[PDB]
Amino acid sequence: LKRKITELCDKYIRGPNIILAISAADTDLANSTALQASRRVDPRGERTIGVITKMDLVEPEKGAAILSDRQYPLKLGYVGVISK
């Protein structure tokens, strides 16, 4: 079931589509599957952009930690935004 869903996701991400990964601020970056699979199919991080969501409930220090990181840099950068 879950394995089947992942299988589709993997197939789709593989080919050179511009992949849009999102990440909740509550979950740690390494922890989230979205960015982890984005790094799985794209090691250079050249064709994937990141969005950090649910960012209203964190310190600005926290935003700086997340919006700008060096642990996992990519072209096109990350974009933090609160949607709701």
JSON list of C-alpha atoms in Angstrom, two decimals:
[
{"chain": "A", "resi": 1, "resn": "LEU", "atom": "CA", "xyz": [0.00, 0.00, 0.00]},
{"chain": "A", "resi": 2, "resn": "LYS", "atom": "CA", "xyz": [2.46, 2.63, 1.22]},
{"chain": "A", "resi": 3, "resn": "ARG", "atom": "CA", "xyz": [5.08, 0.86, -0.83]},
{"chain": "A", "resi": 4, "resn": "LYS", "atom": "CA", "xyz": [2.86, 1.19, -3.89]},
{"chain": "A", "resi": 5, "resn": "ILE", "atom": "CA", "xyz": [2.35, 4.92, -3.33]},
{"chain": "A", "resi": 6, "resn": "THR", "atom": "CA", "xyz": [6.09, 5.45, -3.00]},
{"chain": "A", "resi": 7, "resn": "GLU", "atom": "CA", "xyz": [6.67, 3.47, -6.18]},
{"chain": "A", "resi": 8, "resn": "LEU", "atom": "CA", "xyz": [4.54, 5.95, -8.09]},
{"chain": "A", "resi": 9, "resn": "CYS", "atom": "CA", "xyz": [6.22, 8.89, -6.51]},
{"chain": "A", "resi": 10, "resn": "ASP", "atom": "CA", "xyz": [9.60, 7.57, -7.34]},
{"chain": "A", "resi": 11, "resn": "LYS", "atom": "CA", "xyz": [8.72, 6.93, -10.90]},
{"chain": "A", "resi": 12, "resn": "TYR", "atom": "CA", "xyz": [7.46, 10.42, -11.33]},
{"chain": "A", "resi": 13, "resn": "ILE", "atom": "CA", "xyz": [10.28, 12.18, -9.60]},
{"chain": "A", "resi": 14, "resn": "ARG", "atom": "CA", "xyz": [12.93, 10.35, -11.53]},
{"chain": "A", "resi": 15, "resn": "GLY", "atom": "CA", "xyz": [12.61, 11.92, -14.93]},
{"chain": "A", "resi": 16, "resn": "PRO", "atom": "CA", "xyz": [13.77, 15.54, -15.23]},
{"chain": "A", "resi": 17, "resn": "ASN", "atom": "CA", "xyz": [10.67, 17.29, -13.99]},
{"chain": "A", "resi": 18, "resn": "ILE", "atom": "CA", "xyz": [11.14, 20.36, -11.79]},
{"chain": "A", "resi": 19, "resn": "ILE", "atom": "CA", "xyz": [10.35, 18.79, -8.43]},
{"chain": "A", "resi": 20, "resn": "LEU", "atom": "CA", "xyz": [8.69, 20.95, -5.75]},
{"chain": "A", "resi": 21, "resn": "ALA", "atom": "CA", "xyz": [9.37, 19.60, -2.27]},
{"chain": "A", "resi": 22, "resn": "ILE", "atom": "CA", "xyz": [7.67, 21.06, 0.79]},
{"chain": "A", "resi": 23, "resn": "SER", "atom": "CA", "xyz": [8.51, 20.62, 4.46]},
{"chain": "A", "resi": 24, "resn": "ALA", "atom": "CA", "xyz": [6.66, 21.46, 7.67]},
{"chain": "A", "resi": 25, "resn": "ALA", "atom": "CA", "xyz": [8.75, 23.54, 10.08]},
{"chain": "A", "resi": 26, "resn": "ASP", "atom": "CA", "xyz": [7.83, 21.21, 12.94]},
{"chain": "A", "resi": 27, "resn": "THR", "atom": "CA", "xyz": [9.49, 18.19, 11.35]},
{"chain": "A", "resi": 28, "resn": "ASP", "atom": "CA", "xyz": [13.28, 18.17, 11.11]},
{"chain": "A", "resi": 29, "resn": "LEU", "atom": "CA", "xyz": [14.65, 18.59, 7.58]},
{"chain": "A", "resi": 30, "resn": "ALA", "atom": "CA", "xyz": [16.50, 15.27, 7.60]},
{"chain": "A", "resi": 31, "resn": "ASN", "atom": "CA", "xyz": [13.34, 13.61, 8.90]},
{"chain": "A", "resi": 32, "resn": "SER", "atom": "CA", "xyz": [10.94, 14.66, 6.12]},
{"chain": "A", "resi": 33, "resn": "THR", "atom": "CA", "xyz": [10.52, 12.20, 3.24]},
{"chain": "A", "resi": 34, "resn": "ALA", "atom": "CA", "xyz": [9.81, 14.90, 0.65]},
{"chain": "A", "resi": 35, "resn": "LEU", "atom": "CA", "xyz": [13.27, 16.50, 0.85]},
{"chain": "A", "resi": 36, "resn": "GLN", "atom": "CA", "xyz": [14.87, 13.09, 1.47]},
{"chain": "A", "resi": 37, "resn": "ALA", "atom": "CA", "xyz": [13.42, 11.63, -1.73]},
{"chain": "A", "resi": 38, "resn": "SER", "atom": "CA", "xyz": [14.25, 14.86, -3.57]},
{"chain": "A", "resi": 39, "resn": "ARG", "atom": "CA", "xyz": [17.87, 14.26, -2.56]},
{"chain": "A", "resi": 40, "resn": "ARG", "atom": "CA", "xyz": [17.48, 10.58, -3.50]},
{"chain": "A", "resi": 41, "resn": "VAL", "atom": "CA", "xyz": [16.61, 11.30, -7.15]},
{"chain": "A", "resi": 42, "resn": "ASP", "atom": "CA", "xyz": [18.57, 14.60, -7.30]},
{"chain": "A", "resi": 43, "resn": "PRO", "atom": "CA", "xyz": [21.95, 14.53, -5.50]},
{"chain": "A", "resi": 44, "resn": "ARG", "atom": "CA", "xyz": [23.07, 17.85, -6.94]},
{"chain": "A", "resi": 45, "resn": "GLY", "atom": "CA", "xyz": [19.87, 19.61, -5.87]},
{"chain": "A", "resi": 46, "resn": "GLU", "atom": "CA", "xyz": [19.90, 21.40, -9.22]},
{"chain": "A", "resi": 47, "resn": "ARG", "atom": "CA", "xyz": [16.34, 20.63, -10.42]},
{"chain": "A", "resi": 48, "resn": "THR", "atom": "CA", "xyz": [14.49, 20.74, -7.07]},
{"chain": "A", "resi": 49, "resn": "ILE", "atom": "CA", "xyz": [13.26, 23.73, -5.08]},
{"chain": "A", "resi": 50, "resn": "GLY", "atom": "CA", "xyz": [12.16, 23.54, -1.46]},
{"chain": "A", "resi": 51, "resn": "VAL", "atom": "CA", "xyz": [9.29, 25.20, 0.39]},
{"chain": "A", "resi": 52, "resn": "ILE", "atom": "CA", "xyz": [9.18, 25.43, 4.18]},
{"chain": "A", "resi": 53, "resn": "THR", "atom": "CA", "xyz": [5.53, 25.58, 5.26]},
{"chain": "A", "resi": 54, "resn": "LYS", "atom": "CA", "xyz": [3.78, 26.13, 8.62]},
{"chain": "A", "resi": 55, "resn": "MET", "atom": "CA", "xyz": [6.46, 28.72, 9.34]},
{"chain": "A", "resi": 56, "resn": "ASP", "atom": "CA", "xyz": [4.33, 31.11, 11.37]},
{"chain": "A", "resi": 57, "resn": "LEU", "atom": "CA", "xyz": [4.89, 29.16, 14.58]},
{"chain": "A", "resi": 58, "resn": "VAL", "atom": "CA", "xyz": [8.69, 29.45, 14.80]},
{"chain": "A", "resi": 59, "resn": "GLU", "atom": "CA", "xyz": [11.24, 32.06, 15.84]},
{"chain": "A", "resi": 60, "resn": "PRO", "atom": "CA", "xyz": [12.87, 34.18, 13.15]},
{"chain": "A", "resi": 61, "resn": "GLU", "atom": "CA", "xyz": [15.98, 32.56, 14.41]},
{"chain": "A", "resi": 62, "resn": "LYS", "atom": "CA", "xyz": [14.17, 29.37, 13.41]},
{"chain": "A", "resi": 63, "resn": "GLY", "atom": "CA", "xyz": [13.28, 30.74, 10.01]},
{"chain": "A", "resi": 64, "resn": "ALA", "atom": "CA", "xyz": [16.88, 31.65, 9.42]},
{"chain": "A", "resi": 65, "resn": "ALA", "atom": "CA", "xyz": [17.85, 28.23, 10.45]},
{"chain": "A", "resi": 66, "resn": "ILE", "atom": "CA", "xyz": [15.45, 26.62, 8.08]},
{"chain": "A", "resi": 67, "resn": "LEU", "atom": "CA", "xyz": [15.10, 29.03, 5.18]},
{"chain": "A", "resi": 68, "resn": "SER", "atom": "CA", "xyz": [18.86, 29.20, 4.92]},
{"chain": "A", "resi": 69, "resn": "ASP", "atom": "CA", "xyz": [20.80, 26.07, 5.63]},
{"chain": "A", "resi": 70, "resn": "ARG", "atom": "CA", "xyz": [24.09, 24.70, 4.43]},
{"chain": "A", "resi": 71, "resn": "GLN", "atom": "CA", "xyz": [23.45, 21.16, 5.50]},
{"chain": "A", "resi": 72, "resn": "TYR", "atom": "CA", "xyz": [21.66, 20.55, 2.30]},
{"chain": "A", "resi": 73, "resn": "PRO", "atom": "CA", "xyz": [22.20, 23.35, -0.23]},
{"chain": "A", "resi": 74, "resn": "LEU", "atom": "CA", "xyz": [20.55, 23.44, -3.62]},
{"chain": "A", "resi": 75, "resn": "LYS", "atom": "CA", "xyz": [20.23, 25.85, -6.49]},
{"chain": "A", "resi": 76, "resn": "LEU", "atom": "CA", "xyz": [16.96, 27.80, -6.71]},
{"chain": "A", "resi": 77, "resn": "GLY", "atom": "CA", "xyz": [17.02, 27.98, -2.89]},
{"chain": "A", "resi": 78, "resn": "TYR", "atom": "CA", "xyz": [14.24, 27.32, -0.39]},
{"chain": "A", "resi": 79, "resn": "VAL", "atom": "CA", "xyz": [11.11, 29.46, -0.01]},
{"chain": "A", "resi": 80, "resn": "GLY", "atom": "CA", "xyz": [9.45, 29.76, 3.38]},
{"chain": "A", "resi": 81, "resn": "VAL", "atom": "CA", "xyz": [5.80, 30.80, 3.48]},
{"chain": "A", "resi": 82, "resn": "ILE", "atom": "CA", "xyz": [2.82, 30.43, 5.79]},
{"chain": "A", "resi": 83, "resn": "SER", "atom": "CA", "xyz": [-0.30, 29.32, 3.97]},
{"chain": "A", "resi": 84, "resn": "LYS", "atom": "CA", "xyz": [-3.71, 29.12, 5.66]}
]
